[PDB]
Amino acid sequence: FLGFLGAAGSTMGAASMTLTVQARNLLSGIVKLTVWGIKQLQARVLAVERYLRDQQLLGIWGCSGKLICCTNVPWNSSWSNRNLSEIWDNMTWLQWDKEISNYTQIIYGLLEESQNQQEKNEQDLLAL
Amino acid sequence: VLTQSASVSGSLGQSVTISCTGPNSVCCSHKSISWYQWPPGRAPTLIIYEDNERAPGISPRFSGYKSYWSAYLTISDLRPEDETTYYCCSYTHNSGCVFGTGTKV
Amino acid sequence: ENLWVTVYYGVPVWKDAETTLFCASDAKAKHNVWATHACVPTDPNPQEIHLENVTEEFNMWKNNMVEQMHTDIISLWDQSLKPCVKLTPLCVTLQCTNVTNAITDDMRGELKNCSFNMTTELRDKKQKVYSLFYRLDVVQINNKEYRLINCNTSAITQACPKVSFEPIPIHYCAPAGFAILKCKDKKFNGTGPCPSVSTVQCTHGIKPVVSTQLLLNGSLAEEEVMIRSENITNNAKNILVQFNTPVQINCTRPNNNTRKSIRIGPGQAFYATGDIIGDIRQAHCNVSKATWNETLGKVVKQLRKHFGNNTIIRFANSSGGDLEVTTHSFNCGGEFFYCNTSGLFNSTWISNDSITLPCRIKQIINMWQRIGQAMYAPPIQGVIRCVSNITGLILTRDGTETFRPGGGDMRDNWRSELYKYKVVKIEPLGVAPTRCKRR
Amino acid sequence: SYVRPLSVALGETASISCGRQALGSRAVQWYQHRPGQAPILLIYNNQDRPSGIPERFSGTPDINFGTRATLTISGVEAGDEADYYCHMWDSRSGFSWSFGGATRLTVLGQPKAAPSVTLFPPSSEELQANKATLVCLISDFYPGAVTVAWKADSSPVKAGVETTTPSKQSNNKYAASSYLSLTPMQWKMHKSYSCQVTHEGSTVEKTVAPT
Amino acid sequence: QGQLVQSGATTTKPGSSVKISCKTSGYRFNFYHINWIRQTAGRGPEWMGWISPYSGDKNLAPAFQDRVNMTTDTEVPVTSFTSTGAAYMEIRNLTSDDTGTYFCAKGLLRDGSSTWLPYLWGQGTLLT
Amino acid sequence: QVQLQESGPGLVKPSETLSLTCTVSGGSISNYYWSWIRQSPGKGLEWIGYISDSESTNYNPSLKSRVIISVDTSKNQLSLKLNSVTAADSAIYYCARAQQGKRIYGMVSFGEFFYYYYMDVWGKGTTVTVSSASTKGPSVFPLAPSGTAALGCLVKDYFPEPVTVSWNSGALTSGVHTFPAVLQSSGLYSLSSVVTVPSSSLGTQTYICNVNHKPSNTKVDKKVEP
Ligand SMILES: *[C@@H]1O[C@H](CO)[C@@H](O[C@@H]2O[C@H](CO)[C@@H](O[C@@H]3O[C@H](CO[C@H]4O[C@H](CO[C@H]5O[C@H](CO)[C@@H](O)[C@H](O)[C@@H]5O[C@H]5O[C@H](CO)[C@@H](O)[C@H](O)[C@@H]5O)[C@@H](O)[C@H](O[C@H]5O[C@H](CO)[C@@H](O)[C@H](O)[C@@H]5O)[C@@H]4O)[C@@H](O)[C@H](O[C@H]4O[C@H](CO)[C@@H](O)[C@H](O)[C@@H]4O[C@H]4O[C@H](CO)[C@@H](O)[C@H](O)[C@@H]4O[C@H]4O[C@H](CO)[C@@H](O)[C@H](O)[C@@H]4O)[C@@H]3O)[C@H](O)[C@H]2NC(C)=O)[C@H](O)[C@H]1NC(C)=O
Ligand SMILES: *[C@@H]1O[C@H](CO)[C@@H](O[C@@H]2O[C@H](CO)[C@@H](O[C@@H]3O[C@H](CO[C@H]4O[C@H](CO)[C@@H](O)[C@H](O[C@H]5O[C@H](CO)[C@@H](O)[C@H](O)[C@@H]5O)[C@@H]4O)[C@@H](O)[C@H](O[C@H]4O[C@H](CO)[C@@H](O)[C@H](O)[C@@H]4O)[C@@H]3O)[C@H](O)[C@H]2NC(C)=O)[C@H](O)[C@H]1NC(C)=O
């Protein structure tokens, strides 16, 4: 137990085992028209705003309320040719995001439709 | 104590198979085998680690296999630069690399 | 070898950003200008998490917490002055004389006794009252006629005499989904990759102390004394010296002043300086000549690391400018001192008892940003004596090199405390390949 | 300048307050002055007193502003009757040229003393000069106030008298004189001349006649 | 990337004790072990030992147990993921049978079953 | 160790320079400060001026216009000159040793101090009278006597005060009582001094008066006997 962001320098495989320690600090903390009130309130709205933006994607991919979901889109190696032991036992999430940064918007696309069509297939299957 | 092939060779297009074996102190099932391409007196190169996993960038022609008594290193479709000496490693997580004798191809 | 995208929520990855930081203050209850009563309470366990194996790059000169804090301090002051009494009827013609004389030739005019006609609580009646004014708040007309310094430039507003200017610790915090990154490297230049990093919810207790030349009651270096600037080779970029040993400074205004409530109008009272009980002495500050010599000696050694062991540097006094720039200006116990620092930087250092500083007092202090708004500080009764640490300096090279102090930009004060901190946003969504597939 | 009276009983403790308060830190001097005599410095710094001055003379030190400069005469005696001056110096006021008002200490409870009247007839050389003067000499009385009346035989005479106001002797008692001037004929033509000195309630008389 | 330059190829006679340097670049020096391996002419290549440029933990072959001294000094941060380090190594009871070319090599990964495995090698240094 | 003696004319006419001297005995003159003080009837003690040890002058603004204080360090003689004398200027003029005191309330560097002066040793004083009236010597007559007995002398008609009287050229000092003078309507004082004596000593211990009135430079003496 290293704490919030404690494994930020640890390997992707290691940090992936302490995901709740970052998940619970995503909308809690300590956050009249005075300058401190105008300040403290928009800090309250900004936290809930960004939290629901991430949860919306997590829902539109079919991963609502789970910290690790497997998907159906395959890994286009042009995103990252690196190997599994080269990733999870070598790189940290910070440098990984720096490498895969451009393709995230693309990956977020096929994740969106892979669920929207899977929702359509389970509805055909349940029609029997 | 970890003996490999005396020597072998082929021709451009075919394959070769270097062996690697020893007693129950150096090999095998309880230890991981790694293979190194090593030109004499110069910078070596990792080609295979823990018995078949190849280092990044290694061409898919190189292949590793490990029987219960001896590890193998297949080098299919040979090409000129493969004229080299090859050594095998024997190692666990918390120890060192027990290198092999040698094999020139 | 079938690799699939695997979504991860809660991945330790952040990116630099800008967000609105809110204040936290400890429990202590009257009300200070910093409205610290309106801040959330701080946790008595300021949880700090050490980020093992992490190295982040900092840049205190592109930091935003400073630029954000600077506007907060300004807004807090405009908020505090808003409901207090306007002194526009005080912009009259003043018939002034010197107060009791019989001593040093040209310090009799340093403070004047001034009579003037003033509004009363009834519209058709006037009242001739008198008040003691410092020399630095009035100008002549040319006869013994005088006039407040601000009447031609700005409007005037007196501070509600209940709000205290004594600065108290502020804790700047980041909202949820964000985080503050502390750099814990004891030889940190202020810029570049910091090897020892930790994350905190809020910064430490930062006193919003506004001083000049000398940095008072600030944080101390843990080792050495650090010198910081954007471009030290550029002579137009101030140097922020930070001591590791505090050099105490004792300031006092000895004259036992008296407050005289004057009814300017209905519900509007003007607090004038009534009389001086006892002797009329001089306001001044002491700093131990020995320690100020020593700690000015560790400044020059770290100064040479950028200018040469054989090069000889020297300290001079402020080359001019506005009053708040050419003097160690600060607020002590309520009144605004302006202490001539010539007796502190007057030394040339070569390859290899206490001093006293005459201070003057203003009560018409104006804004360093826009000219057009100015405050009257109501006179504090009794004898003033505050004792403070000098924890840093603000020097300036000229281009043998000479260093003179200065700096009338408030946000240099905040950089001396916010250099360790950095605000980043968390992005808990991460995608990566795995051999697991849905269904 | 104008004079402030103060009357303390003998043996008690006089407290002489300074007539002019100090605006800042002060350096006050106390002088003792009996008219027709050199003033003597009692206390120079607010509390320091020169040698030859007893401990019964004390002045308040300037330790904190607010204290009032007061000279304290403990165990008053008849020799303490004098004008007392407060030479007040301070930080805020300028040059203290004036010694200030005078507080005239009169010590009460002194014992009543009767006069010692002595009359003299005109001298021969005086009568030779066609001028005759009788001299009545009163001394050693307290309180210092006497009435003098001259009597030619039984009838009173008041033309020609010249009487001195009382004046303190070194014995702390008072003495006075009076001179009846007259022509040498009205000295011989009369039977006798008498000097009647009434002090407090009683009258006393000494007489003389040309013989 | 990553590159490990070594010292010069100078020679000395038996009984002495020599030090060889290894200067790393292009990678976090603290994240991977540093390994030293010798290619003697009259023997097979022999692994000498590795140390942790982070935990300071060392481990040598028993044929070098009381005769070798392997150290490292702290890294200099260059960027968030690039450092510059140095790795030093000496031999005590040294003769001329220890002649050969000497290499320094950093570890493979920073977790797993092949953490310290010599992956990225140096230029080599000719000896006595 | 240090005493002080005034010296004056006793009379000066209206509109004329009044000159006085003061001779120190026992100490140096150019080492101390010296002040002049005068006491007129009714008016309190009046500080006239003072001179420094380095002989700097400073006069009371009450009479700064018409006063010049000097000093002659060849001996220990200090002088005073007062021009344009009028009737109100008649007083008993004292001179005294002023000692400089330095009262320090704040910081000496800022000059937060002041100087106070105090006269610690004084002279005996000298009487001067302002009157256009002329001087005149007395006319001492004997007052012959007749358990004890008393005898005296009648110093008649002199102007102005003072008159010094001693018995037996200074030998007889006990029982002497010199009475304050009498300003007669004619405008000139008259004094009498007597001495109480044992009755038996009348024969024949000669008792000799000694009258001095220096304003007229008339020294007289006379005897008494039944
Ligand atoms: C920042 O830095 C600043 C600078 O460093 C600093 O400023 C300092 O501030 C303080 C306070 O604010 C100042 O302190 C004051 O000091 C005054 C001077 O004191 C010195 O001098 C006196 C007198 O010296 C004469 O007499 C002595 C003998 O006694 C001789 O030896 C001297 O040579 C000299 O005499 C010769 O010289 C004269 C001038 O040339 C001639 O006129 C004379 O004829 C001779 O030729 C000394 O007595 C003092 O000694 C005492 O202190 C030393 C250490 O210094 C000690 O060992 C010991 O305790 C000694 O007693 C000293 O050397 C003081 O006058 C002043 O205190 C008086 O004033 C205040 C305010 O008015 C009063 O409240 C206070 O109570 C004092 O009053 C007493 O004394 C006066 C004068 O006699 C009396 O009138 C009065 O009634 C009272 O008397 C009572 O107490 C006496 C004892 O105190 C006692 O004797 C009496 O019997 C009676 O009971 C005050 O202390 C200081 O000067 C500033 N610094 C400088 C450089 O100026 C600031 O604080 C710093 N900090 C900040 C800003 O936070
Ligand atoms: C920060 O960054 C550093 C640098 O990357 C990280 O340090 C590395 O961590 C990884 C995993 O945490 C380490 O890999 C492991 O290596 C050990 C080998 O060490 C063992 O053998 C030593 C020699 O015999 C022995 O001394 C050790 O025993 C104790 O002594 C040391 C003394 O310092 C002490 O520090 C140790 O902690 C031990 O208590 C030790 O036993 C190897 O055993 C591991 O293999 C096991 O685990 C893996 C999975 O982790 C598993 O797959 C295997 O099958 C086996 O079960 C593992 O390979 C690496 O050695 C560290 N050092 C480097 C890379 O230089 C650090 O973790 C980072 N921390 C954070 C918070 O980010």
Ligand SMILES: *[C@@H]1O[C@H](CO)[C@@H](O[C@@H]2O[C@H](CO)[C@@H](O[C@@H]3O[C@H](CO)[C@@H](O)[C@H](O)[C@@H]3O)[C@H](O)[C@H]2NC(C)=O)[C@H](O)[C@H]1NC(C)=O
């Ligand atoms: C500032 O200037 C004002 C003048 O406008 C001063 O006020 C005046 O001060 C004098 C001197 O104290 C006062 O006279 C005094 O009056 C009291 C009470 O009657 C009397 O006891 C004193 O003897 C003296 O005569 C005067 O009344 C006063 N007038 C007003 C309108 O205040 C003031 O003192 C000056 N203050 C300072 C700090 O310089």
Ligand SMILES: *[C@@H]1O[C@H](CO)[C@@H](O[C@@H]2O[C@H](CO)[C@@H](O[C@@H]3O[C@H](CO)[C@@H](O)[C@H](O)[C@@H]3O)[C@H](O)[C@H]2NC(C)=O)[C@H](O)[C@H]1NC(C)=O
């Ligand atoms: C640097 O910090 C110190 C301490 O935190 C500050 O000293 C503080 O100064 C104020 C005002 O001078 C003091 O308030 C006063 O306290 C006295 C106590 O007797 C009281 O009488 C006054 O009415 C007033 O309340 C405060 O106590 C004091 N703090 C301490 C611990 O001494 C100093 O002012 C700071 N420096 C600057 C430049 O702000």
Ligand SMILES: *[C@@H]1O[C@H](CO)[C@@H](O[C@@H]2O[C@H](CO)[C@@H](O)[C@H](O)[C@H]2NC(C)=O)[C@H](O)[C@H]1NC(C)=O
């Ligand atoms: C001036 O600096 C000193 C030294 O840093 C301060 O004294 C320390 O204060 C802290 C906070 O109260 C304590 O934790 C330390 O134990 C103190 N050490 C010593 C030796 O005193 C002092 O408080 C500072 N003063 C001001 C006004 O900032």
Ligand SMILES: *[C@@H]1O[C@H](CO)[C@@H](O[C@@H]2O[C@H](CO)[C@@H](O)[C@H](O)[C@H]2NC(C)=O)[C@H](O)[C@H]1NC(C)=O
């Ligand atoms: C400043 O002056 C005020 C008055 O002008 C002083 O107040 C007095 O303080 C004493 C304390 O012992 C009280 O007993 C008095 O009643 C107070 N009087 C008034 C009118 O307030 C105060 O003490 C002075 N302060 C200093 C440091 O000298």
Ligand SMILES: *[C@@H]1O[C@H](CO)[C@@H](O[C@@H]2O[C@H](CO)[C@@H](O)[C@H](O)[C@H]2NC(C)=O)[C@H](O)[C@H]1NC(C)=O
């Ligand atoms: C500033 O003032 C403080 C207190 O007024 C001084 O600190 C005191 O120093 C003495 C040394 O003699 C100690 O005994 C006290 O305990 C200290 N007081 C406190 C509250 O710590 C200090 O020396 C002064 N410094 C200067 C430069 O004037």
Ligand SMILES: *[C@@H]1O[C@H](CO)[C@@H](O[C@@H]2O[C@H](CO)[C@@H](O)[C@H](O)[C@H]2NC(C)=O)[C@H](O)[C@H]1NC(C)=O
């Ligand atoms: C390995 O060699 C290094 C040489 O750099 C030794 O480090 C120094 O050893 C001396 C001798 O005891 C110490 O005095 C120094 O403090 C050590 N450090 C440095 C930076 O010089 C090291 O001791 C040797 N290995 C062992 C196990 O001793």
Ligand SMILES: O=C(c1ccsc1)N1CCN(C(=O)C2(c3cccc(Cl)c3)CC2)CC1
């Ligand atoms: O305390 C000091 C100080 C200390 C030593 S000299 C001055 N301040 C710094 C200078 N200053 C300002 O510029 C402000 C301001 C805000 C609102 C109205 C006005 Cl008039 C002025 C912005 C704060 C005044 C307050």
Ligand SMILES: *[C@@H]1O[C@H](CO)[C@@H](O)[C@H](O)[C@H]1NC(C)=O
């Ligand atoms: C990978 O992506 C590229 C473009 O992003 C696309 O053209 C290509 O067909 C993809 N390959 C596979 C195997 O999906």
Ligand SMILES: *[C@@H]1O[C@H](CO)[C@@H](O)[C@H](O)[C@H]1NC(C)=O
């Ligand atoms: C580990 O990640 C770094 C980051 O780019 C990379 O340089 C290195 O080659 C990786 N390790 C392996 C064994 O590929």
Ligand SMILES: *[C@@H]1O[C@H](CO)[C@@H](O)[C@H](O)[C@H]1NC(C)=O
């Ligand atoms: C105050 O005093 C100084 C110096 O004595 C003088 O120059 C100035 O004119 C004075 N001012 C007034 C208003 O009296």
Ligand SMILES: *[C@@H]1O[C@H](CO)[C@@H](O)[C@H](O)[C@H]1NC(C)=O
């Ligand atoms: C107040 O007004 C009057 C006009 O009646 C003027 O004479 C006086 O000077 C004014 N007061 C002051 C202090 O100027």
Ligand SMILES: *[C@@H]1O[C@H](CO)[C@@H](O)[C@H](O)[C@H]1NC(C)=O
């Ligand atoms: C106001 O008057 C002062 C008096 O010197 C002058 O310096 C200043 O420039 C004036 N302000 C403006 C805006 O003119």
Ligand SMILES: *[C@@H]1O[C@H](CO)[C@@H](O)[C@H](O)[C@H]1NC(C)=O
């Ligand atoms: C600050 O220190 C860093 C640390 O390496 C250095 O790279 C940089 O050049 C320094 N900048 C200045 C202005 O001193």
Ligand SMILES: *[C@@H]1O[C@H](CO)[C@@H](O)[C@H](O)[C@H]1NC(C)=O
């Ligand atoms: C610093 O200033 C010098 C000249 O003052 C300039 O040449 C140099 O480019 C500046 N540094 C940077 C980083 O711009």
Ligand SMILES: *[C@@H]1O[C@H](CO)[C@@H](O)[C@H](O)[C@H]1NC(C)=O
């Ligand atoms: C200056 O002196 C220091 C001593 O600490 C030394 O380390 C540095 O190398 C010297 N530099 C020069 C240029 O002399």
Ligand SMILES: *[C@@H]1O[C@H](CO)[C@@H](O)[C@H](O)[C@H]1NC(C)=O
């Ligand atoms: C700086 O020092 C010089 C030399 O004494 C002086 O003339 C000047 O007034 C000083 N300036 C300031 C702002 O102290």
